[PDB]
Design a binder for these strands. Structure first.
Ligand SMILES: Nc1nc2c(ncn2[C@@H]2O[C@H](COP(=O)(O)OP(=O)(O)OP(=O)(O)O)C[C@H]2O)c(=O)[nH]1
Ligand SMILES: [Ca+2]
Ligand SMILES: [Ca+2]
Length: 1203
RNA sequence: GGGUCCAC
RNA sequence: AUCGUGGACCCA
């Protein structure tokens, strides 16, 4: 102890100084009141001194307007909480007011006019806070916008009234225009920018005026975009601010916008790792049902909430046992996850988003100082975010002489806690020291344990989902004869035993029923527990009386509501959200558990605009009811895109478009564009002419032209286009061409597998004597394959990959290709595959039927080139079901060889690399999979795998002839594993060739038959390939050009030269629009036209119905309209702050689905799930609906966004 | 899972 | 009448 404790208190609640700083400073003043104050004053500067070391990236912006003189203020601090603290507020307010009356604009004048009072706060608050920048603006009429505290703007305008400047001050706030007019721009920044960009493209080989006209064009936009004038007005994006101004014959003499912490470095912080940094210097020196508890640490930055979390972690594993950046520690009875709450807006975001709710927090104040002023905001955060419980850890107590002075701090904190309706008198306050606890000081060491004790007994145990009342969100409803109505979904809370009664509540007038049963795909069941996907059978309720969106619940347990208040986070542009602000009548979709519902909102008192990234409270009223109570999370959507997240906070009491304009566009769409001859050919020739190349002078030329693999990238680009553009056109007349050539090819491959099948089952040449590269690779590949693949396909593996999907089987036509029809209609199967079906039949109570048991698949023909089709075979359904099982296991395994058959994007980039580097080759095989013979396959794969492949393939094929083939190849295109299998065979060979040549196997990459491996390996790979029956496509393999190509991307010395194809006769406006869009994407850099192609574009644009020539959409939205500028689009309809544009759609009619088949398909899928910053988890997977395509077009409005 | 696009 | 796989956009 030292001096009277009652005296320090008098000093503190007079000065706002830390406890110990009041003590030691009162000890040297010999107990002199008005004296101690000064010793601290003169010190307040040395304090701020060491303070001004810390980065202060947070703060506020303030704004003041006197008649027609205004000023913008940027005083900032280092924390959210300080930013909204009364004291910091009052400083910033005064430092502003004082800068108004005294029209100051010199940062350093007031920066010093207050330097005195600035140490005043910095002492008290204990964060570096400095005036950053000031500026002032005068104009004839001016107006300010304040976007919370984070952005302020001053706008000076001549000719405009109150509303005008308000509105364009808001726009400046949203759209960061760095200049008032496109010409204002630094004729320098733009000068060298046009000299830099004039090569980037002139290096393509683009002729002078071509790259000149293009660069010019960009910078016309480039400047228009960063300029208030040429910006789409934020409250009216169809017209620009420029045009808006000119409509009120007014103008902006200038503007200012400051944003808190702009340009400040703003250091990243990693809490998790960060702790392990402190638990390092010290660490060196089955209860699996235990509940998980989320706790939060919150307090003053250097009061050491960090050091504590460290002390907690060490001591808690040193003694007892052993989302997103969260340390976690274990207690004999509970498991804790622990996050730091560094900022107020950050936490509110994570609470809404769900990426971190919290069961209890721990407030960390140092007894050295005591509550800070911003300590109230810490607690206030807790109150506003609804933390149920707050524990206090009093830290740094070893540095408190008088324990009567701890009695004092603990008092202030209870007093605050209670001021915010927390149970102050009753909240645990452990008095300890994190630091001495890391230094294994058994005393202070047990105080941590103590605090932990409170976490166990003070924060109550979170209700297990199973302990809650029953609720299942209905995903789909089926009517099954002789079973009744049944709903499927995942049970969210509780248990439902057959017998029990249930309400079905949500969209309609709530209804009641009883549980007739509970089933999964494998077994029937008598109850469904939380977390289980199930069907639930219901008694007496028709299936047109249930609806996705409704919930199934224990009766009275949940109610339907329409109006409620919430806290939402609006996604930033960054995070895939809106890029434009919205306003009063925002009208999006609210996605609850399993469905969207339209709803209007009302903003809070005084907020008029919302920006991507904003938290906000809003009151939401829905177009019809949804079952809900407090805590229900939801997503905000714009036609499929997720733009925000929210949680219901308190449920309340509840209570455009175009007709003969869509009709106009629909008529246009079903119009038939009509011309003379081959419109495609005409377009291709007009293109070639515009690039000064000879046209095709006949149909027969369009498919027989070879490029020159030299010349500049630009020359080559149009050459390759010319070689490819018409190469797959399906409507040439000139030609007795047929699918005859396809079947010839199909027979040639079989004949080749017949050779290699004989050769490879007889390689006793005479004697060992001679050794060969091929023989060796097969041996090398075999062994490596076995290592990757197993002796046999796991039963788990197959159980998580088998499934139906897609199109026609031997028993179903395209119409009945949906999985639900494969389950509802008996599928054919192969003699050797029958046991698989039976094993399936034995594992489920559902009927598993086979229609016929033959060894045939159906070989048909399918389009490919202008000069040949491609022979496919349609499999028996049950065989397909299992072929996909092995195809899915091979897919996974290949991931261990760096092969990823989900991402063609990795092959495209190595093709680009290869064309610049010449170290990687791209190779193609001729009849890639058709050439993989039985023999090769039998030598490479484990016998276990080979037998299974043999059970699962179709051994025979019946052709359109009626003729048969007994397959020489291991499998045909159309099989459910041929693709993954061919990928494996090719990879293993190429990898083996690498090892034999002393290259790295990892350099080998394969997507089906798109092979990429080091250029030096090619001659040896060619040799191996020849040996094993393959024939490499010398025309499509490149190991030495400037040219590469893989998975649809073509490169010439790094430049993208992938072409586009006119595949069909152009007959409808949709046909023409695709072609023109394909031209657009081919000839367009960043929305800017190569002029050579533009001319051809505008010519054929004219062949479209007129409305359709102006109906434009942004790229990335398909081809139901011309890709162009959407702001120009006259048919655009902005509705509720979301932009709807109409696109052409293929028009469909509904068809009846198969009820049992769909139900089976549903349960089967849920069975699959179970066998195998993130909030997108707020969505599902959709009901089976069947539809037939009529041959007409429809018009669909869709949600759109400038970019 | 459909329609479309682009690919293996 | 149009097999298997992947990716994107719209639907759903
Ligand atoms: N089931 C199926 N597989 C395909 C299809 N297209 C390509 N593939 C698969 O990927 C491999 C690549 O085929 P392609 O390179 O286009 O043709 P190819 O059979 O090897 O013949 P070629 O190069 O001589 O034209 C072969 C085949 O397994 C297809 O349309 N259906
Ligand atoms: Ca090929
Ligand atoms: Ca290829």
């Amino acid at each position: 102890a030292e001096i009277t404790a009652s005296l320090v208190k008098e000093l503190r609640e007079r000065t706002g100084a830390g406890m110990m700083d009041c003590k030691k400073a009162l000890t040297e003043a010999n107990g002199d009141i008005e004296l101690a104050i000064e010793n601290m004053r003169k010190s307040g500067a040395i304090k701020a001194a060491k303070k001004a070391g810390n980065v202060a990236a947070d703060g506020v912006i303030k704004t003041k307007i006197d008649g027609n003189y205004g000023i913008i203020l940027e005083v900032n601090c280092q924390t959210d909480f300080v930013a909204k603290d009364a004291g910091f507020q009052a400083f910033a307010d005064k430092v502003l007011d004082a800068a108004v009356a005294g029209k100051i604009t010199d940062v350093e004048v007031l920066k010093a006019q207050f330097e005195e009072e600035r140490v005043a706060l910095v002492a008290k608050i204990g964060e570096n806070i400095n005036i950053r920048r000031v500026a002032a603006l005068e104009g004839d009429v001016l107006g300010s916008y304040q976007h919370g505290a984070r952005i302020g703007v001053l706008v000076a305008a001549k000719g405009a009234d109150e509303e005008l400047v308000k509105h364009i001050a808001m726009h400046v706030a949203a759209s960061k225009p760095e200049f008032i007019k496109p010409e204002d721009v630094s004729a320098e920044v733009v000068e060298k920018e046009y000299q830099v960009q004039l090569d980037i493209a002139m290096q393509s080989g683009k002729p002078k005026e071509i790259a000149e006209k293009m660069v010019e064009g960009r910078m016309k936009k480039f400047t228009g975009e960063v300029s208030l004038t040429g910006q789409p007005f934020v409250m009216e994006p169809s017209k620009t601010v420029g045009q808006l101004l000119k409509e009120h014959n007014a103008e902006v003499t200038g503007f200012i916008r400051f944003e808190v912490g702009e340009g400040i470095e703003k250091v990243e912080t990693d809490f998790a790792a960060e702790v392990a940094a402190m638990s390092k210097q010290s660490h060196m020196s089955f209860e699996r049902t235990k509940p998980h508890v989320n706790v939060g640490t919150i307090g003053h930055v250097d009061h050491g909430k960090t050091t504590l979390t460290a002390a907690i972690t060490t001591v808690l594993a040193k003694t007892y046992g052993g989302n997103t950046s969260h340390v976690e520690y274990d207690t004999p009875t509970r498991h804790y996850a622990h996050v730091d709450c560094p900022g107020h807006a950050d936490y509110v975001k994570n609470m809404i988003t769900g990426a971190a709710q919290m069961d209890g927090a721990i407030l960390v104040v140092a007894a050295t100082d005591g509550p800070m002023p911003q300590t109230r905001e810490h607690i206030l955060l807790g109150r506003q975010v609804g933390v149920p419980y707050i524990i206090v850890f009093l830290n740094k107590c070893d540095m408190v002489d008088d324990e009567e002075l701890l009695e004092l701090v603990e008092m202030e904190v209870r007093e605050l806690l209670s001021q915010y309706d927390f149970p102050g008198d009753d909240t645990p306050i452990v008095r300890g020291s994190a630091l001495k606890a890391l230094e294994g000081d058994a005393e202070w060491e047990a105080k941590i344990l103590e605090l932990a004790g409170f976490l166990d007994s003070y924060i109550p145990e979170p209700e297990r989902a199973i302990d809650k009342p029953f609720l299942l969100p209905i995903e789909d409803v089926f009517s099954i004869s002789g079973r009744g109505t049944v709903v499927t979904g995942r049970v969210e809370r509780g248990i439902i035993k057959v017998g029990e009664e249930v309400e079905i509540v949500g969209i309609k007038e709530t209804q009641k029923s009883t549980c007739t049963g509970v089933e999964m795909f494998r077994k029937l069941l008598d109850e469904g527990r939380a977390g289980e996907n199930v069907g639930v059978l219901l008694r007496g309720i028709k299936r047109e009386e249930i609806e996705r969106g409704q919930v199934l619940a224990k009766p009275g347990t949940i109610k339907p509501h329409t109006k409620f208040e919430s806290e939402v986070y609006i996604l930033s542009k960054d995070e895939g959200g809106r890029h434009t602000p919205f306003f009063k009548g925002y009208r999006p979709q609210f996605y609850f558990r399993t469905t969207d519902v339209t709803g209007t909102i009302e903003l809070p008192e005084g907020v008029e605009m919302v920006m991507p990234g904003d938290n906000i409270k809003m009151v939401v009223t829905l177009i019809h009811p949804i079952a809900m109570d407090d805590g229900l999370r939801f997503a905000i959507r714009e036609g499929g895109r997720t733009v925000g997240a929210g949680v219901v906070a308190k449920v309340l009491s509840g209570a455009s478009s175009r007709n003969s304009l869509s009709a106009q566009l629909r008529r246009a769409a079903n119009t038939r564009i009509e011309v003379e001859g081959n419109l495609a050919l005409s377009i291709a020739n007009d293109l070639l002419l515009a690039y000064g190349q000879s046209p095709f002078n006949s149909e027969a030329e369009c498919i027989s032209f070879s490029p020159r693999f030299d010349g500049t990238p630009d020359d080559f680009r149009i050459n390759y286009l010319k070689a490819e553009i018409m190469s797959k056109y399906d409507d040439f007349s000139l030609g007795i061409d047929t699918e005859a050539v396809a079947w010839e090819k199909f027979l040639a491959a079989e004949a080749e597998c017949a050779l290699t099948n004989a050769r490879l089952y007889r390689p006793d040449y005479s004697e060992d004597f001679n050794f060969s590269l091929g023989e060796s690779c097969i041996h090398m590949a075999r062994r490596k394959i076995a290592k990757l693949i197993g002796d046999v396909p796991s039963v788990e593996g197959m159980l998580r990959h088998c499934r139906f999907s897609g199109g026609a089987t031997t028993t179903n036509n395209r119409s009945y290709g949906h999985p639900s029809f494969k389950f509802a209609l008996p599928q054919a199967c192969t003699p050797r595959a029958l046991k698989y079906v039976l094993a399936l039949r034995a594992s489920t109570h559902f009927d598993i039927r086979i229609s016929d048991i033959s060894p045939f698949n159906k070989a048909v023909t399918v389009p490919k080139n202008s000069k040949t089709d491609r022979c496919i075979a349609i499999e028996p359904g049950w065989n397909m079901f299992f072929q996909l099982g092995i195809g899915g296991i091979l897919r996974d395994r290949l991931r261990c060889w760096g092969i990823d058959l989900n991402d063609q994007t990795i092959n495209q980039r190595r093709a680009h690399e290869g064309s610049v580097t010449n170290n990687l080759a791209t190779v193609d095989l001729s009849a890639a999979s058709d050439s993989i013979s039985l023999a090769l396959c039998e030598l490479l794969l484990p016998p276990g795998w080979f037998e299974v492949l043999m059970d699962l393939r179709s051994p025979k094929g019946r052709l359109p002839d009626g003729s048969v083939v007994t397959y020489e190849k291991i499998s045909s295109m159309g099989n459910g594993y041929t693709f993954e299998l061919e990928s494996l065979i090719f990879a293993s060979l190429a990898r083996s060739v690498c090892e034999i040549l002393d290259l790295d196997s990892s350099e080998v990459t394969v997507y089906g038959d798109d092979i990429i491996l080091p250029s030096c390996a090619v001659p040896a790979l060619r040799e191996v390939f020849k040996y094993v029956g393959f024939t490499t496509n010398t025309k499509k393999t490149f190991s030495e050009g400037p040219f590469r190509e893989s998975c649809g991307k073509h490169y010439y010395s790094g430049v993208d030269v992938t072409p586009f194809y006119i595949r069909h006769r152009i007959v409808s406006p949709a046909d023409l629009i695709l072609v023109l869009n394909n031209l657009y994407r081919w000839a367009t850099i960043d929305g800017v036209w190569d002029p050579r192609a533009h001319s051809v574009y505008l010519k054929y644009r004219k062949l479209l119905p007129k409305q359709l020539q102006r109906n434009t959409i942004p790229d990335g939205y398909g081809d139901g309209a011309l890709v162009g500028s959407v702001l120009i689009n006259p048919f655009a309809k902005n509705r509720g702050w979301i932009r709807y544009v109409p696109v052409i759609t293929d028009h469909t009619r509904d068809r009846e689905r198969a009820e049992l088949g769909s139900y089976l398909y549903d349960l089967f899928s849920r069975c699959l799930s179970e066998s195998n910053a993130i909030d997108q988890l707020i969505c599902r997977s959709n009901p089976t609906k069947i539809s037939r395509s009529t041959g007409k077009f429809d018009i669909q409005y869709i949600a759109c966004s400038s970019r």
